[PDB]
Amino acid sequence: NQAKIFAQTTKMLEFAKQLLETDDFSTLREAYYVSKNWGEARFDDQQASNNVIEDLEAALGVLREHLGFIPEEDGSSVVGPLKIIEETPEGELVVDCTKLGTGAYNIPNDVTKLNLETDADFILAIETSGMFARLNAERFWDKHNCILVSLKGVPARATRRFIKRLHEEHDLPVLVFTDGDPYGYLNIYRTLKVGKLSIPAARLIGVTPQDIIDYDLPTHPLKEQDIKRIKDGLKNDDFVRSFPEWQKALKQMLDMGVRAEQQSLAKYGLKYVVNTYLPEKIKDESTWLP
Amino acid sequence: QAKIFAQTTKMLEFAKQLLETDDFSTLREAYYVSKNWGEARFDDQQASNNVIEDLEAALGVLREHLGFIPEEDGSSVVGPLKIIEETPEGELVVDCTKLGTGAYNIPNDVTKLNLETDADFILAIETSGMFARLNAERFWDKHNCILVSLKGVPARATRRFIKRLHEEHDLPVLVFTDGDPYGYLNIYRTLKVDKLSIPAARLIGVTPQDIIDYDLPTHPLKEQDIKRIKDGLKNDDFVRSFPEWQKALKQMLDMGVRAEQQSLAKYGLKYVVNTYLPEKIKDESTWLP
Ligand SMILES: [Mg+2]
Ligand SMILES: [Mg+2]
Ligand SMILES: [Mg+2]
Ligand code: NA
Ligand code: NA
């Protein structure tokens, strides 16, 4: 009810004050369990605690992480021309993302305290961890002076924040590379573009429906769920309804009746994505979706 | 058999070429490369995966040592550990005590990493949120331990990384999960019990007894949770092979509740670091396995 949520919001704001004064954070689950000390104002369930944090963000006009409340999910992996810098009592901590070798930097749950320095030309957001592995191994980021960020499915909040900060703070175009399927377009790419953390300038450079034809990619048939996702999008999705190229691309995929994974390029060689497809796709912005 | 024998020949020819060119192929990459093999092409991803698995088992050589790597990346690591690689541009050193708020992302294939550490043990943490708390409070520095998150059931790369650290540097593997059936029977069990198993891994906590001893905030076991326990007790070889695990699972059934590892935050955000973990690690009588 009214008064209970208000009392809980008051306790949550006192907790946020204590977090900020102690340079600390609380994950969403941590907050819920801290609320078990609030007697009759304790949260009954995790969702109710999350609801107050979401509502504080909406009511104060401040990102939840700036109030001290951070996600349970960590961010993805990053490699490339970028220094992540943190100030400490002893001095300066620098993580050079061109010196991580086979591995990468794991984006933390909260990226608020990271300082970012880079002369990269753009960010390449890559759906799969397997594709990130191939692009990292072949040093695609060096030749093309771009930051690689994996998404690993629909990007976590921390991943979205990391990419958005790079984009906004360093004027870096966000080029997105997903599988060529409805989930890639309407869930993974769409979440980056549309969602406070949205990046409206983000561009899907590929696997487009027309890419499947142009590069003759090994395909798989659309499944029942894929077709429904497309149809639902064309009818109800406001993102799809705003961009005629997206409407056309989705109608084309439905007519083709097939889809293709981004690693299907390996039929033409393990380096084909690195030396032929990506270079061609990044150069030709008439083939991007938006 | 005829087609599978042709496919196995082609897969080994591919493996030889990967090894000769110091390269790798992910599972999906292997499948799509096979679309060039005429009559020996794989019909679907599962068929390709099956040949790789069978090659690993028949030859007794890990997948990754033939050059075939997982699609999933590993988890995150911080602590007293240096990851070293010899490259064309010189030696690369990643010092896992100098990563700050972030951490090292274990790659899909850990075969070529060199590992140097003077750590005392490995703490394998289920949730990324608990990993973030232990990282931020520098639990790894205070207790000279490598923190490795699991993020649900551990990926193959994560398992391999923890196994290499354990075997090559003589480091006990202490596992810290939510106190629930999934944590015990899926997450911990996968780490402990298959070529990448770590039989000496020990579950230090959240045990059913911990739920009672620390008076943790709980949640009722769900329908599925009770079924997981009862199936585990009757048909699971790991559970049926350990009496202490049988005792703990029956105890959790009696209680009817489960607890998350982050529920220790009821007693303060640093209670896990300052009170719970220091206590649990000192006394091995509260560990489960
Ligand atoms: Mg996909
Ligand atoms: Mg090479
Ligand atoms: Mg859990
Ligand atoms: Na409530
Ligand atoms: Na086949």
UniProtKB/Swiss-Prot annotation, chain B:
Residues annotated for Mg(2+) binding in this entry: E126, D178
Cofactors demanded by this protein: Mg(2+)
Domain of life: Archaea
Reactions it catalyzes: ATP-dependent breakage, passage and rejoining of double-stranded DNA
Any one GO biological process: DNA topological change
Catalytic activity, EC: 5.6.2.2
GO cellular component: a single term: chromosome
Keywords assigned: ATP-binding, DNA-binding, Isomerase, Magnesium, Metal-binding, Nucleotide-binding, Topoisomerase
Catalytic residues identified in the record: Y32 (o-(5'-phospho-dna)-tyrosine intermediate)
Cofactor info, note text: Mg(2+) is directly coordinated by Glu-126 and Asp-178 as well as indirectly coordinated through 2 water molecules by Asp-180.
Gene Ontology molecular-function annotations: ATP binding; DNA binding; DNA topoisomerase type II (double strand cut, ATP-hydrolyzing) activity; magnesium ion binding
Family membership: Belongs to the TOP6A family.
Subunit description: Homodimer. Heterotetramer of two Top6A and two Top6B chains.
Function description: Relaxes both positive and negative superturns and exhibits a strong decatenase activity.
Name of protein: Type 2 DNA topoisomerase 6 subunit A
